[PDB]
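retry 2 of 3: previous attempt timed out while embedding sodium ion. Reduced batch size to 1 and resubmitted. Inputs unchanged:
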Amino acid sequence: NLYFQGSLRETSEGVILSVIVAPNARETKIVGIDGTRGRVKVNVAAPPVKGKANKELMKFFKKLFGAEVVIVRGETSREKDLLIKGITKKEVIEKLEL
Ligand code: NA
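retry 2 succeeded.
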């Protein structure tokens, strides 16, 4: 029963997916929804240093969506916004709900 609608918006350029990362994880994976923040809780299998969590986060979502993913907010924050270029909200929700 995970509802992603409060963590996404569809813009001129694609979809902005809003996440909150928890680093130091055994496995990169979606774990739930932070309804206070409107963000997907994502465990990231990387330490919080040297950009490594950013690289792993983008690798994971590029594979999931089959689209280019860039960080547009939160490069050095836990609360990161990911622009998935050229995609619709319907397609993103379908892939997140896998
Ligand atoms: Na929500």
